[PDB]
């Protein structure tokens, strides 16, 4: 719905499972490197007035000038007005643009489509935002917490129970 | 996706919501 800015790159290869993106400038990568890590999300264009969310699962950088590759997986679709739907039918043709998801979009998605909010912390890239998981279904069923020594398990459990 | 002896061949389709909505 909002203005998204300048694009970072263009599509080079597509398939119902994998989508591949390529950057060719070092300055742009250095400008946006904070938001191009694993676990984050990108917006891809599939025709006029429609967008496709994808999740980053691989980055590579090689010089012999610079090439940068990013790999993704489709998750769902987002229109202009704001509606979000799981299930990616479409395939984005090459030559399409890729943009970086602004946080307000995700804030709205979490606001409108979660029945029983329950804050489980803060988002990675932006500390101000809050991450609202469904509380009704978490406690109703089991949970598992795993981690290695020196990582902060007990304080985490403490925080969960304290808010509980 | 419908599969079995009933269909001529395995197929995929899209539903349409019923009227009146069950609740």
């Amino acid at each position: 719905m909002p203005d998204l800015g300048t694009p970072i790159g263009s599509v080079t290869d597509s398939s119902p499972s994998l989508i591949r993106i390529e950057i060719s400038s070092a300055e742009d990568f250095e400008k946006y490197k904070s938001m191009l890590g694993v676990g984050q999300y990108l917006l891809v264009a599939s025709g006029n007035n429609l967008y496709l969310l994808a999740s980053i699962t691989g980055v590579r950088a090689t010089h012999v000038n610079f090439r940068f590759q990013i790999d993704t997986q489709p998750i769902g679709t987002l229109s202009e007005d704001g509606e979000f739907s799981r299930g990616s039918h479409s395939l984005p043709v090459p030559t399409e643009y890729a943009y970086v998801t602004p946080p307000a979009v995700l804030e709205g998605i979490f606001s409108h489509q979660i029945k029983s909010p329950f804050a489980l912390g803060t988002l990675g890239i932006s500390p101000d935002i809050k991450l609202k998981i469904d509380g009704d279904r978490f406690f109703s069923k089991h949970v598992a917490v795993v981690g290695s020594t020196g990582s902060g398990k007990s304080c985490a459990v403490a925080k969960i129970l304290q808010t509980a | 996706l419908i599969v079995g002896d009933a269909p001529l061949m395995p197929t995929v389709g899209h539903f349409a919501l019923p009227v009146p909505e069950p609740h």
Partner: protein, 388 residues
Amino acid sequence: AEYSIKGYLYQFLKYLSEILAAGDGARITIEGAIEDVDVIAAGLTTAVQCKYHEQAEKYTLGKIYKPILLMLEHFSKNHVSYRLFCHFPGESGTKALTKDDLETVLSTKGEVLRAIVARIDTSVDYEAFLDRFAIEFGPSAEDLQVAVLASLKDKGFDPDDIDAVIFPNAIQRIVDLATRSDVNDRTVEPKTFLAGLREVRRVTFTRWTRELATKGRMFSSLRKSLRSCLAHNSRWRVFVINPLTIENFDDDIVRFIKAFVQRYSSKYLHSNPPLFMLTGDYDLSVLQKRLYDAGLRCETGKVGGTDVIIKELFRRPILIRNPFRMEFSLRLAKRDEVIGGPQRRPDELFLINVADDEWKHEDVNVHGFKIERLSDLEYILQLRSDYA
């Protein structure tokens, strides 16, 4: 300054309700209103003027102070039958106040009220206003429109189509023949409307129709109808426009074009620039320069700038991927100069305030609208979030 728009609408809906429960061989004639300025005074000088107010539980003189009063200025200024419409609970009757009531109301204790009454002239035939004026107690707009469409379904139509394409259209014809400057017959034949409204296929965006209550649901249907057309990268679309009726045209035509080409003609997968045509005596050169100032180029199909060559006007442009470069983005001409037709027919033709054109044909889709402000059409094509 008042202009009493909603009251002016009320008796139009009254008229269509009269035509509603009517047998064959019945005729009714409307008479315009003085808000129009025509020395011709066509219409038998049978103009009518009305005003509308609500939210009063039981009838009193105090509740209805200002309306009747404000009428009299008109008399002092110069078959203009003043009337009033209102609905109040427990009050269902039409009355005519006799002499003592007029003399009762003449004096007003509210001072700023009489401050303008001073504008009144002395020479007043007091009882003429009374015998001419009539008070009407009929149902408020809400239930009257509800029943209007609830019964309009009775004839037999598609339940949804009536909301966005029919009910706005009839009121338009009504108020059109009401205040049309040049003369014609007011007489209306009931059965022939059924013939006309069935075949007519257009949508109307105008000043009167917005005030209608159903407005707000006609926008969204049109928005959702065009979504499948405007979700393609490569398509051939044509436009025709008539700039007489449109308001503030010279200042808003440019922004519209920029917004359209920014979203629909700005990339490598967009391989068929759009075409804009205008009818009339408009001067293009100014528009061409004003768009160049913004950073866009046009194809006018003129090699030497006397007349048009069709083959050059319908050619394909050069494209380059890295960095993007576009030879031209849009097409411009005047309809009179274009003689002939394209080798391949339009997929979608748009006509804004044009009755007919020679390119209509079975395969083509022909959307039609009647517009007074261009900001309305953007929302239809998804270039802004909220309507006016």
